[PDB]
Design a binder for this molecule. Structure first.
Ligand SMILES: NC(=O)C1=CN([C@@H]2O[C@H](COP(=O)(O)OP(=O)(O)OC[C@H]3O[C@@H](n4cnc5c(N)ncnc54)[C@H](O)[C@@H]3O)[C@@H](O)[C@H]2O)C=CC1
Ligand SMILES: Cc1cc2nc3c(=O)[nH]c(=O)nc-3n(C[C@H](O)[C@H](O)[C@H](O)COP(=O)(O)O)c2cc1C
Ligand code: SF4
Ligand code: SF4
Ligand code: SF4
Ligand code: SF4
Ligand code: FES
Ligand code: FES
Ligand SMILES: [Mg+2]
Lengths: 230, 42, 59, 62, 431, 217
């Protein structure tokens, strides 16, 4: 048929045209690190955590956005890709606040886990960090924007899934901030989901605040009855 | 001949000169292409 | 370095140091610590329950 | 404190396949409910679709 | 066959009204050879124009030096149903660069004719010229020239006795250096923030309004009608192989006569500086360093500038890159660390903030360089800064991160002893 | 170094959604032309020009101006907010009658731009980012303005004043204070960026049409 042959760590795999490097790695069972990529959202490509080396290619490519080409050998664990991951994690952690004990996303943080699995174990940042003022978007989503890593997942979800275009970015460079630019509540029947998509403790549940840690909780798989969707 | 500088009319441009020239140019333009809808939100 | 009876300390201003992160509860080899927390009246992250079973503690 | 009386409240077992877990449950005499594995279906991603000429996939911000 | 370059005859230049001493208007442009036999070039077909551009050896005048014929041929695919556009990059963001401003204010008609010729070559329906927002009078002059071209029938309906329809639009930016990047320029035209998009797709597939597009520099567009009229062989006669033609140079900084001048491509840097800029202030011995291709190119010291040529390959061999051919010279009386730190501060102030490496790392490098200027650091931090620059370079969405990493690398490579001396002085006087 | 300008809006008696703003009918005709410049599926492309036009009508951009532009183009207000806070030429706060922008980038800093900055500072009695008490001038430090050959230079209300000495900028300031407009361009009489005494190029008359046209054309 129309399937093309690519290689993940030298292992052959047949993929459809338009498949990205990230999905090609997924088909073999390797999960590429990510912060801005979501399956249900449009591709952003700004967090650069998915950078991976293509064999016989001098430049690393963004796996979440780059379509795979026939005969490409993706080197998921090569030295170049690991160094790229370490550099990106260092940049992400340079201005991040030391809020882990008081952050609700302590044991459930993709930033924490991906720093432990793909980043370095120390810092060489000898400067001062930046701090931004928090935003009020209603009584459901608690906002602490110093923890924001500017992945723009919340903006994409609000625009594409919820159909609400009130979220965005203001400023430029290091002081670019995610918010509304006016005092306004982000109130929609799907508003709480931005808590789930946010990889960090920038957006958290307000009624759930400070009540439990993830390792304590017992998970019961069940069904909603608040409507007839099930 | 050469010694004379001949770009002095930019000395007499106002605040609205650019948009006025655009308004004058509007009648010289070919009809615009259409994507089929009013906007991507339509 | 001697370890004796447990104590909860506070800052010089008089406010307690504990911010209910539950790291001590997580690491406790005997599960001797029980913690419950909620936002305070002024929004602070503080504990409402902090129990140590001294007969389960291994010090 | 939270008190319980059933000894199996914390018992969770790990298995490689559904068949292994079913065999373990049947040989141990436990009535079981099996739930089929949920796998996220593969999706069609296209970065260029963000800048569409006429489709609605065109994004207003990035 | 030629071995020496850098004595370009006056009659052999393209931008004959660079200094604005003639009439930039339609009559004045027609006097200097503009809009001559444009109908013939239009009727000779897009394939012929593309071939002439290919044989000309014309490379990217924006700073990257990509062969322009190859890109304009990338646009040569059959129609797909969407319109096709040409976008002329007139952002002029690079510090030290002033050539496009001069060729827009004093010779707009060459730019308009280049727009028409390139649009015919790529089959575009219209040309969007993204002028810098600060260049208001230049934009007004361009609009007046476009009005004159419309009145004379040189552009617009049928554009000639040629049968081709072509529109030229002028859109103004609003203070953004990143909007010079081609994809960020496309985003800015569409009414969004000037944040670049990822590649692929390339503009020839998905560009402005999602349509096939080519983004070209003002100089690249403006030299094209002259290339078509005089032939690609004439243009390739100048300069070395793969570095052919003539170039506009902006010499600024510590020179007696800072100026813009058009000269043959592979001219020696010293020869150009002495012949046109009046030499280095205080004499050639007074020279300390040169930034040859705008703020995004690494500096080189006197020993390299002694016998280096001014083109892509020779400057790449000198570990710099030709860039935009904007020469910024510094004598031995200036704090080179302060100048590099000022450039890094500019890059911190100009990054769009989309991708984390550029955003956070350039902020970090700015803070580190600010500390370096005073000597408040330790010698072990120089290598750490080098590693930070390497972590930025090659990991960002666009080349602004590379353009911020390269000056730091050049400063370290050529003046590490000065940084260490500053650190020792600060430690001595602070204890 | 630091920005110093906020990117969050808090309502003010002089800057709130009910602040009166509207477009003049001539500006409405200009808006019609600007919109007509674009294909009839993508009208958001006119956000940057029209916003600019609003500033040209008001001197600055109140939140009501952004709301009106968003309403006119039928784009969400947040996109207009993003555009207004991204581009530095937009004044989201009131600015003086004469906005003075001094370039301090390295090519201009090399040719003594600090002397010009301090001369303006002394003449106006204001600091780098302040405005005069009579609301006549605003001083602002900007990046490279594309006139590096004519450094040092400043930009005042769309006009480039180049090759400045401190005396030159003082004469410009007090001529603006007098009431009439100083003539733009470089000082020192070099006529737009050729060598000051060199004249090493474009010396003989330029060649006309057909000078070097190839055969068969
Ligand atoms: N003129 C000015 O004011 C400024 C110039 N620059 C210069 O711009 C340079 C970097 O610009 P970039 O666009 O990032 O370099 P680039 O090499 O990635 O792109 C150059 C041109 O070639 C095209 N191109 C390159 N590879 C292609 C491919 N495989 N397929 C199709 N098209 C391809 C690109 O679409 C682009 O139009 C820098 O060296 C800098 O000196 C930088 C800032 C300002
Ligand atoms: C950050 C950045 C800013 C740029 N600014 C400009 C600019 O202002 N003018 C320009 O012509 N090119 C600029 N470029 C280079 C453009 O990408 C270039 O114009 C484009 O690739 C095609 O130009 P060409 O016709 O010379 O090949 C910039 C590139 C980057 C990375
Ligand atoms: S978001 Fe993650 S890394 Fe940041 S403070 Fe919270 S738990 Fe720690
Ligand atoms: S608030 Fe969360 S989801 Fe939104 S951009 Fe910041 S990190 Fe991403
Ligand atoms: S919960 Fe335990 S570890 Fe955390 S602050 Fe309180 S006492 Fe310390
Ligand atoms: S490198 Fe800088 S300017 Fe370029 S996309 Fe990334 S953040 Fe924006
Ligand atoms: S996951 Fe690909 S750049 Fe963020
Ligand atoms: S450095 Fe000042 S105009 Fe360019
Ligand atoms: Mg979250």
């Amino acid at each position: 048929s129309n399937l093309i042959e690519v290689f993940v760590d030298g292992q052959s795999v047949m993929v459809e045209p338009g498949t990205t490097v990230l999905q090609a790695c997924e088909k073999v069972g390797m999960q590429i690190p990510r912060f801005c990529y979501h399956e249900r959202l449009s591709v952003a490509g700004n967090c650069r955590m998915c950078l991976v080396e293509i064999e016989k290619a001098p430049k690393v490519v963004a796996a979440c956005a780059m379509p795979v080409m026939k005969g490409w050998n993706i080197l998921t664990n090569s030295e170049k890709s690991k160094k790229a991951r370490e550099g990106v994690m260092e940049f992400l952690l340079a201005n991040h606040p030391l809020d882990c004990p008081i952050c609700d996303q302590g044991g459930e943080c993709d930033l924490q886990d991906q720093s432990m699995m793909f980043g370095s174990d120390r810092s060489r940042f000898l400067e001062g960090k930046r701090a931004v003022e928090d935003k009020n978007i209603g009584p459901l989503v608690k906002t602490i924007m110093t923890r924001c890593i500017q992945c723009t997942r919340c903006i994409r979800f609000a625009s594409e899934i919820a159909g609400v275009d009130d979220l965005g970015t203001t400023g430029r460079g290091n002081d670019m901030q995610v918010g509304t630019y006016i005092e306004k509540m982000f109130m929609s029947e799907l508003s709480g989901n931005i808590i789930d998509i946010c990889p960090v403790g920038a957006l958290t549940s307000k009624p759930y605040a400070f009540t439990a840690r993830p390792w304590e909780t017992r998970k019961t798989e069940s069904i909603d009855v608040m409507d007839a969707v099930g | 001949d050469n010694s004379t500088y001949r770009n002095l009319q930019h000395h007499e441009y106002s605040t609205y000169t650019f948009l006025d020239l655009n308004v004058e140019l509007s009648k010289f333009r070919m009809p615009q292409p259409s994507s089929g809808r009013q906007s991507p939100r339509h | 370095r001697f370890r004796g009876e447990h104590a909860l300390r506070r800052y010089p201003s008089g406010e307690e140091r504990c911010i209910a992160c539950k790291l001590c509860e997580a690491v406790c080899p005997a599960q001797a610590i029980t913690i419950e927390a909620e936002p305070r009246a002024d929004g602070s992250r503080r504990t409402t329950r902090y129990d140590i079973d001294m007969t389960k503690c291994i010090y | 404190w939270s008190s319980t009386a059933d000894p199996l409240s914390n018992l969770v077992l790990t298995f490689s396949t559904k068949e292994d877990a079913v065999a373990f449950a049947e040989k141990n005499g436990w009535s079981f409910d099996v739930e089929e594995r949920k796998v996220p279906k593969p999706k069609s991603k296209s970065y260029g679709a963000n800048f569409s000429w006429n489709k609605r996939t065109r994004v207003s911000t990035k | 066959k030629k071995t020496s370059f850098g004595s370009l005859k006056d009659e052999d230049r393209i931008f004959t009204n660079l200094y604005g001493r003639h009439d930039w208007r339609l009559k004045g442009a027609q006097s200097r050879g503009d809009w001559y036999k444009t109908k013939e070039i239009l009727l000779k077909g897009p394939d012929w124009i593309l071939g002439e551009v290919k044989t000309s050896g014309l490379r990217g005048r924006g700073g990257a030096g990509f062969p322009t014929g190859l890109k304009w041929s990338f646009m040569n695919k059959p129609s797909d149903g969407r319109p096709k556009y040409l976008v002329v990059n007139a952002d002029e963001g690079e510090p030290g660069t002033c050539k496009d401003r001069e060729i827009i204010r004093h010779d707009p008609h060459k730019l308009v004719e280049g727009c028409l010729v390139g649009g015919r070559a790529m089959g575009a329906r219209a040309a969007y010229i993204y002028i810098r927002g600060e260049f208001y009078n230049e934009a007004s002059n361009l609009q007046v020239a476009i009005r004159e071209a419309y009145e004379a029938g040189l552009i617009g309906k049928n554009a000639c006795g040629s049968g081709y329809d072509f529109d030229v639009f002028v859109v103004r930016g609003a203070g953004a250096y990143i909007c010079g990047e081609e994809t960020a320029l496309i985003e800015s035209i569409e009414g969004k923030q000037g944040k670049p998009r990822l590649k692929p797709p390339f503009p020839a597939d998905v560009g402005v309004f999602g349509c096939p597009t080519t983004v070209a520099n003002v100089e690249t567009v403006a030299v094209s009608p002259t290339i078509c009229r005089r032939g690609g062989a004439w243009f390739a006669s100048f300069g070395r192989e793969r570095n052919s033609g003539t170039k506009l140079f902006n010499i600024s900084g510590h020179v007696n006569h800072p100026c813009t001048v058009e000269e043959e491509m592979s001219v020696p840097l010293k020869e150009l500086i002495e012949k046109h800029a009046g030499g280095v202030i205080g004499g050639w011995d007074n020279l300390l360093a040169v930034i040859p291709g705008g703020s995004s190119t690494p500096l080189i010291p006197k020993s390299v500038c002694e016998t280096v040529l001014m083109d892509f390959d020779a400057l790449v061999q000198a570990q710099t890159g030709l860039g935009t051919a904007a020469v910024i010279v510094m004598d031995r009386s200036t704090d080179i660390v302060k100048a590099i730190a000022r450039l890094i501060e500019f890059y911190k102030h100009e990054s769009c903030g989309q991708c984390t490496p550029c955003r956070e790392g350039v902020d970090w490098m700015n803070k580190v360089m600010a500390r370096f200027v005073k000597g408040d650091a330790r010698p072990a931090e120089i290598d750490s800064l080098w590693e930070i620059s390497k972590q930025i370079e090659g990991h960002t969405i666009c080349a602004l991160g590379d353009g911020a990493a390269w000056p730091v690398q050049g400063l370290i490579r050529h003046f590490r002893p000065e940084l260490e001396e500053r650190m020792q002085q600060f430690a001595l006087q602070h204890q | 170094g630091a920005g110093g300008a906020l990117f969050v809006h808090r309502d003010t008696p002089e800057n709130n959604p009910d602040t009166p703003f509207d477009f003049t009918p001539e500006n409405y005709k200009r808006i019609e032309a600007i919109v007509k410049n674009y294909p009839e599926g993508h009208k958001a492309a006119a956000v940057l020009p029209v916003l600019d036009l609003a500033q040209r009508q008001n001197g600055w951009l109140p939140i009501s101006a952004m709301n009106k532009v968003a309403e006119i183009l039928q784009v969400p207000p947040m996109r207009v907010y993003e555009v207004a806070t991204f581009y530095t030429m937009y004044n989201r706060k009131p600015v003086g009658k004469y906005h003075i922008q001094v370039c301090t980038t390295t090519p201009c800093m090399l040719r003594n731009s600090d002397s010009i900055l301090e001369a303006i500072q002394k003449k106006l009695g204001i600091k780098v980012g302040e405005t005069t008490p009579d609301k006549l001038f605003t001083l602002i430090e900007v990046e490279c303005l594309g006139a590096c050959v004519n450094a040092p230079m400043v930009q005042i209300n769309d006009n480039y004043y180049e090759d400045l000495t401190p005396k030159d900028i003082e004469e410009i300031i007090d001529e603006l204070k007098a009431g009439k407009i100083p003539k733009p361009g470089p000082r020192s009489g070099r006529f737009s960026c050729e060598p000051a005494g060199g004249l090493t190029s474009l010396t003989e008359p330029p060649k006309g049409p057909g000078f070097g046209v190839q055969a068969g054309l």
